[PDB]
């Protein structure tokens, strides 16, 4: 066993599941209407105010 052991290395094979669902499932978000807002980019770069 010592003599054959010289020619061996660990085989990196492991077992897992076909599908693993995430720890937290994505929460379904309700649709809420909101108007067109032209100020939402003012804090990005050199913005300009009304």
């Amino acid at each position: 066993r010592r003599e054959i052991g010289i020619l061996t290395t660990n085989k990196n094979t492991s077992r897992t599941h076909k599908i693993i669902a995430p720890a937290n499932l994505e929460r379904p978000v309700r649709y809420i209407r909101k108007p067109i807002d032209y100020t939402i980019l003012d804090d990005i770069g050199h913005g300009v105010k009304v």
Binding site: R1, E3, I4, I6, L7
Partner: protein, 78 residues
């Protein structure tokens, strides 16, 4: 499966064919000797899983190790 090469590449070397002893020292009788040599006739035309299976048992871990180590030396030399 492995099979033998073509004639011009077949590197032959003379084998010292053993003198035939009495049947009792082989399979038991002439009839049994003939029967068994026919049985094993199938295995002479290739090298495959059954041959490898036998080689494995008969050599054990130590025989395999030394053969592998020596095959490596043949390869290193070539």
């Amino acid at each position: 499966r492995f099979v033998r090469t073509v004639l011009p590449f077949s590197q032959e070397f003379q084998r010292d064919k053993q003198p035939n002893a009495q049947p009792q020292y082989l399979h038991g009788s002439k009839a049994l000797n003939l029967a068994y040599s026919s049985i094993y006739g199938s295995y002479r035309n290739f090298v495959g899983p059954p041959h490898f299976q036998v080689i494995c048992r008969l050599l054990g871990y130590q025989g395999i190790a030394v053969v592998m180590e020596e095959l490596l030396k043949v390869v290193k030399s070539l």
